[PDB]
Enzyme design. Structure first.
Site, mmCIF file in Angstrom:
data_model
loop_
_atom_site.group_PDB
_atom_site.id
_atom_site.type_symbol
_atom_site.label_atom_id
_atom_site.label_comp_id
_atom_site.label_asym_id
_atom_site.label_seq_id
_atom_site.Cartn_x
_atom_site.Cartn_y
_atom_site.Cartn_z
ATOM 1 N N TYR A 57 -11.045 -3.481 3.227
ATOM 2 C CA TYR A 57 -10.272 -2.772 4.191
ATOM 3 C C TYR A 57 -11.038 -3.017 5.733
ATOM 4 O O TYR A 57 -12.085 -2.249 6.040
ATOM 5 C CB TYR A 57 -9.949 -1.334 4.084
ATOM 6 N N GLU A 82 0.865 -1.175 -0.060
ATOM 7 C CA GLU A 82 0.026 0.002 -0.107
ATOM 8 C C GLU A 82 0.962 1.216 0.187
ATOM 9 O O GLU A 82 1.747 1.430 0.814
ATOM 10 C CB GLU A 82 -0.902 -0.051 1.196
ATOM 11 N N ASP A 134 -4.441 10.484 8.471
ATOM 12 C CA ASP A 134 -3.170 10.113 9.199
ATOM 13 C C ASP A 134 -2.910 10.794 10.530
ATOM 14 O O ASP A 134 -2.796 12.115 10.525
ATOM 15 C CB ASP A 134 -2.292 10.279 7.922
HETATM 16 O O1 LIG Z 1 -0.336 0.984 10.795
HETATM 17 P P1 LIG Z 1 -1.138 2.301 10.927
HETATM 18 O O2 LIG Z 1 -1.876 2.585 12.114
HETATM 19 O O3 LIG Z 1 -0.181 3.639 10.416
HETATM 20 O O4 LIG Z 1 -2.207 2.305 9.575
HETATM 21 C C1 LIG Z 1 -1.606 2.331 8.068
HETATM 22 C C2 LIG Z 1 -2.739 2.500 7.261
HETATM 23 N N1 LIG Z 1 -2.084 2.880 6.128
HETATM 24 S S1 LIG Z 1 -3.527 2.753 4.789
HETATM 25 O O5 LIG Z 1 -2.610 2.836 3.583
HETATM 26 O O6 LIG Z 1 -3.908 1.314 4.890
HETATM 27 C C3 LIG Z 1 -4.771 3.584 5.103
HETATM 28 C C4 LIG Z 1 -5.998 3.060 4.975
HETATM 29 C C5 LIG Z 1 -7.173 3.967 5.240
HETATM 30 C C6 LIG Z 1 -6.915 5.179 5.747
HETATM 31 O O7 LIG Z 1 -7.865 6.172 5.942
HETATM 32 C C7 LIG Z 1 -8.998 5.618 5.841
HETATM 33 F F1 LIG Z 1 -9.525 4.641 6.539
HETATM 34 F F2 LIG Z 1 -10.065 6.482 6.341
HETATM 35 F F3 LIG Z 1 -9.494 5.407 4.479
HETATM 36 C C8 LIG Z 1 -5.809 5.739 5.955
HETATM 37 C C9 LIG Z 1 -4.549 4.747 5.522
#
Ligand SMILES: O=P(O)(O)OCCNS(=O)(=O)c1ccc(OC(F)(F)F)cc1
Ligand SMILES: O=P(O)(O)OCCNS(=O)(=O)c1ccc(OC(F)(F)F)cc1
Ligand SMILES: *Cc1c(COP(=O)(O)O)cnc(C)c1O
Ligand SMILES: *Cc1c(COP(=O)(O)O)cnc(C)c1O
Ligand SMILES: [Cl-]
Ligand SMILES: [Cl-]
Ligand SMILES: [Cs+]
Ligand SMILES: [Cs+]
Ligand SMILES: [Cs+]
Ligand SMILES: [Cs+]
Lengths: 389, 268, 389, 268
Positions: free
Chosen positions: D175, D49, D60
């Site tokens: 997700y 990703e 984020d």
């Molecule tokens: O391990 P962490 O806590 O840093 O999480 C990493 C996630 N990275 S990602 O690209 O999957 C990802 C997936 C969804 C996100 O926001 C949303 F849910 F609103 F869509 C943001 C990042």
């Protein structure tokens, strides 16, 4: 000879040089005429409503008084255009100046609020305004000086004497002594020679008149007491006037106690000064043993009269009003309390009145009492003073 | 005593006007002020007008404001002024001495007590600058009880009622203001309004002294010619003090020259 | 699924992470319920009257328009408690928060006025307030930061991104994404995701409703145009809303032109930006060629939205409202003119609206026109900015 | 293409979960980011990703906020990201590549054009973080027209209606959010709500990947045990970049060690 009584008991009078007596007589005549003139009254009311924003709210505090038997309302002169009650009477005096055919205004100021009020009224109403201000005050009140200048007023520093408010009062009178044929002296409080104590009261009395109507509407009865800070006496007499004949209503005026009465660093002449003759009146004042005039000290610059209006000295003498003092520290605590519990930032002047109401409540928390505090101004101007402490 | 009455009779016998300087007591210090006053007298002053330093002299322009401030810088108090006045009288038994007071200094310790002290040291008159005839009753009553002349002011604009009151209530001399405004040499007033001077005489007022803005011999002469008994000059005298602070001997010489010239102008 | 339309034509929507959708739906539901609840309406009206000081005056300028055929009124939101129109909608949103059973408030602020408004409402109504503010804004808005702290709010500097308003907007949403079960996000303008553009309009619409009643009373007819500055769009939509169906009444919104549109240093996205998706909405915004969000520049910090409310973009698209820009220099001249000729110190934000009215008058001085300018705030805060120039 | 479908079939054959790291493209520079990504793959990443740096990443937390800022400090643009993506695909033909986008970057040049560019460089999926299912229609339609899987989010609180929509509209993977809030290793979420995982399977959703707060092997194992097809870890990976900025070789060694351990946890 005068149309109206220049005295309140022994206090007041017209202690000016002979040259100024015609100006005072002319002013008195114009005022008496204006008070009977429905057109003048309608014009004044129109400015107060549509320009200044009257009537001002009467706000019930509930958070401050929780767990006590005090009910507290604040009369919101902080919401008037300009941020203080001074606007009411400058508009009336500007209209008197025009009634007399005068095109120029002289004013004194210490903290600068009266100077700003005078300049705004003069801008609106087409008068050429000049403002005397002690050089020490000019230095420490840059914001207000800039406001006055933005509104087209001439600000004239006064370097004589102590270079503070009393010196500016003197200079305004010296100018008027030579310029009265074309200029009106817009005195900033309910003090000085007759007819000013009377005029200023009458042009501030809507504070108490509104409060009475508002409290009757909300509570169905008059207050147990109305409480106001006392610099020269204008906001207090404006709140008190319409209640003087309501014998059940307590009238409480709050002078600045500064660092504490015992220190001598205060501004509480009514209760802790000595009767003298100065600035056109016989009244209690801050004076040396020999009779030289002194300054008032307060954390709040606006409570920086070195005397008090004669009608307050009179109401005290007959027992119709009671006068108390509040120290710098008490005022600061009231300021902080109102900000945190009501979301209102009060002027440090007004914070003295609130502090005394808070003491009335806290000292006797099971006493049932309906109180009104005159919130004479907003405290935006004071945030850096309070910050630095 | 009757010092003004005696003076005006003597001057009338000589067809002469009075020249009356003003200074602030204790400006620029007690010892120099005593020397200044002796110089004024020796140079031909007919009477004196003497100011007690006050914090808030609201009938005075910058020159005399600054004289008050200098006296305060020297620590001069009303009690010290009275000591000075007693000594001046002990040196000079006939010259009329008038005080220029502000009300609070008279009212401070009690009105009656103030005029009693004036009588004790031998003052002849008191002009309270911020008490108009309308407020004057307790002041004039106390003055008269202590053989002090209360001085009142006739503005150029005075109506008939005011002229009658000033004529009735005043003693010693009548103060004829040359103009509106405050003291100062930088602002010259009018010739004594002949109409006022004549009405005052009609009402048997005390003899008129013209004051405010009187800085030159030609003005002294003109005042007398218009029918005034004399003229008072303050700022012009005080300016000589101010200019010569660093040179006390030169100060006295310049005062002597100026006063001599002003007094010469009053002579027939 | 929603109760109300989230779009104004193509503009608006709910462009938030999925996690926030329940919070937006809950808010919308509570708002629709509150709008039908006479008790909620009475409580809101009571606060607006007795705490904030409504109705605000409608002041006729006569000095400014002398010698022209323009009649100009100012709607005096400068006289509202707090000194700007923001107070109206924070009180309504605080009441919604309580209706939903929430005890905590999150707010964003740039210039600090929304932060102060949020803190005062939270102090009054017993809510725990936290305010995000870009670190660069914290540095330059010490007075407002101190006010917020005096009123018991937590001020949290945001150091991410550009450390300005958009970054604080982001941080507020990041916090809410985790805290929505206990906290309400008190958004500060008529922008962001549905239902905020709708809620903020409805909680500001008393501006236009009062103006309509006041102008009918004084002039016997509706204005030819109402004119308001546009930061995010709240004061303008509050003035416009009640006139949208009065087809004869012109609606003119004034964006900041900064140093001039041609310089790129402005805050005029509606007319000179490009549609994008950010802060929960589809709307015109200040963005790079690649789609990175940019800052708005104006001499007035309060016009520092890098976008505009979607209802303004819609009203523009259909031609119901016209949008113009005013530069820093034009706003400064209007500020000075109002101070000198009317004795009112206007916010520099509001000075943009006044400047455009002055241009309407001066360009066509024999055109008969009845204009209302929304004077969104007072300019005490701006005296040193203006001084330094 | 069908890269996720092929991956999940292969993993199922081995009773294995997916481990899927997130990094920001171009953090801390283009060349080092390419090396980072090659290291992740060599160490056993099953899919990627990849974030395109955006000015306002409002889903984020601080770790990934700071990654975006580092990429901007290196001048990284979306066009440069696409160049990187084309090269990554040219090196690695089967690994699924997902982008983490914010809406404005997709909408900027036109939605259809964005997904067309994704297809051209060989991206497999796009997750638009600030587009909820309610606003998703033009995004999902464009994705499907260009053979790109649109990824949707199942919050822990998801009701039946939402589960049905996510199941219907998504492709590639679903997700599964571990918790509310924003990305960050400092905040651990729940075990995949077994009820959600089972309902998604009932509705024939794309296989679930759990993300948010996944920083340890034990969490990867637990996700798979709960019925998810795998786990995504971002902040924990990005923290290794941040810690080792001054030591690029050590950075790659630490990334390799961490990814190897996380992938090991996914094995049966
Ligand atoms: O391990 P962490 O806590 O840093 O999480 C990493 C996630 N990275 S990602 O690209 O999957 C990802 C997936 C969804 C996100 O926001 C949303 F849910 F609103 F869509 C943001 C990042
Ligand atoms: O020569 P100038 O212009 O300085 O005038 C000097 C006057 N000195 S004085 O003591 O006679 C004197 C007389 C009257 C005064 O005020 C009053 F009229 F209000 F009473 C003030 C000073
Ligand atoms: C000037 C001022 C005062 C004191 O003056 P008063 O004449 O005694 O009323 C009190 N409050 C405020 C806010 C002021 O500006
Ligand atoms: C905040 C502010 C504005 C701009 O915000 P809007 O949402 O566009 O109204 C305008 N005027 C004042 C006085 C403000 O405080
Ligand atoms: Cl006589
Ligand atoms: Cl599917
Ligand atoms: Cs109570
Ligand atoms: Cs006082
Ligand atoms: Cs006009
Ligand atoms: Cs804007």
């Amino acid at each position: 000879t005068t149309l109206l009584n220049p005295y309140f008991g022994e206090f007041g009078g017209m202690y000016v040089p002979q040259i100024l007596m015609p100006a005072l007589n002319q002013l008195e005549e114009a005022f008496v005429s204006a008070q009977k003139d429905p057109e003048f009254q309608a014009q004044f009311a129109d400015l107060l409503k549509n320009y200044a924003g009257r009537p001002t709210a009467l706000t019930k505090c509930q958070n401050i008084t929780a767990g006590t038997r005090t009910t507290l309302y604040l009369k919101r002169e902080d919401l008037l255009h300009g941020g203080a009650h001074k606007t009411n009477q400058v508009l009336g005096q500007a209209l008197l100046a025009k009634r007399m055919g005068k095109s120029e205004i002289i004013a004194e100021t210490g903290a600068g609020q009266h100077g700003v009020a005078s300049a705004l009224a003069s801008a609106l109403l087409g008068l050429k305004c000049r403002i005397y201000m002690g050089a020490k005050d000019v230095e420490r009140q840059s914001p207000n000086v800039f406001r006055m200048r933005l509104m087209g007023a001439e600000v004239i520093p006064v370097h004589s004497g102590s270079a503070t408010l009393k010196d500016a009062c003197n200079e305004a009178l010296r100018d008027w002594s030579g310029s009265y044929e074309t200029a009106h002296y817009m005195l900033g409080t309910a003090a000085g020679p007759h007819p000013y104590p009377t005029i200023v009261r009458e042009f501030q009395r809507m504070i108490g008149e509104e409060t009475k109507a508002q409290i009757l509407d909300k509570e169905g009865r008059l207050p147990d007491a109305v409480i106001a800070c006392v610099g020269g006496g204008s906001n207090a007499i404006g709140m008190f006037a319409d209640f003087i004949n309501d014998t059940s209503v307590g009238l409480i005026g709050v002078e600045p106690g500064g660092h504490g009465i015992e220190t001598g660093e205060h501004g509480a002449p009514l209760k802790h000064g000595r009767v003298g003759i100065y600035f056109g009146m016989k009244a209690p004042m801050m004076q040396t043993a020999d009779g030289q005039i002194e300054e008032s000290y307060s954390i709040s610059a606006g409570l920086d009269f070195p005397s008090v209006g004669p009608q307050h000295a009179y109401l005290n003498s007959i027992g119709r009003a009671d006068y108390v003092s509040i120290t710098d520290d008490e005022a600061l605590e009231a300021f902080k309390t109102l900000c945190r519990h009501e979301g209102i930032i009060p002027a440090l002047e007004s914070s003295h009145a609130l502090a005394h109401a808070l003491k009335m409540m806290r000292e006797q928390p099971e006493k049932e009492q309906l109180l009104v505090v005159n919130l004479s101004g907003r405290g935006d101007k004071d945030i850096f003073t309070v910050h630095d402490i | 005593m009757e010092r003004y009455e005696n003076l005006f009779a003597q001057l009338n016998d000589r067809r002469e006007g009075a020249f009356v300087p003003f200074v602030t007591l204790g400006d620029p210090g007690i010892e120099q002020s005593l020397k200044i006053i002796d110089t004024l007298i020796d140079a031909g002053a007919d009477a004196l007008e003497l100011g007690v330093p006050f914090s808030d002299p609201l009938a005075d322009g910058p020159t005399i404001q600054n004289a008050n401030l200098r006296a305060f810088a020297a620590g001069v108090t009303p009690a010290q002024c009275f000591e000075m006045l007693a000594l001046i009288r002990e040196k000079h038994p006939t010259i009329p001495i008038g005080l220029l007071m502000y009300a609070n200094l008279v009212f401070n310790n009690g009105i009656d007590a103030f005029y009693a002290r004036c009588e004790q040291v031998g003052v002849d008159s008191v002009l309270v600058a911020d008490v108009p005839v309308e407020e004057s009753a307790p002041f004039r009553q106390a003055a008269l009880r202590h053989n002090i002349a209360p001085i009142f002011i006739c503005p150029p604009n005075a109506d008939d009622d005011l002229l009658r009151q000033v004529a009735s209530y005043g003693r010693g001399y009548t103060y004829l203001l040359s103009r509106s405004g405050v003291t100062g040499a930088e602002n010259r007033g009018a010739l004594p309004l002949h109409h006022l001077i004549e009405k005052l005489k009609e009402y048997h007022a005390a003899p008129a002294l013209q004051g405010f803005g009187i800085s030159s011999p030609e003005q002294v002469s003109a005042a007398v010619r218009a029918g005034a008994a004399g003229a008072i000059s303050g700022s012009a005298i005080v300016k000589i003090i101010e200019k010569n602070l660093a040179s006390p001997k030169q100060m006295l010489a310049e005062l002597r020259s100026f006063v001599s010239a002003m007094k010469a102008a009053s002579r027939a």
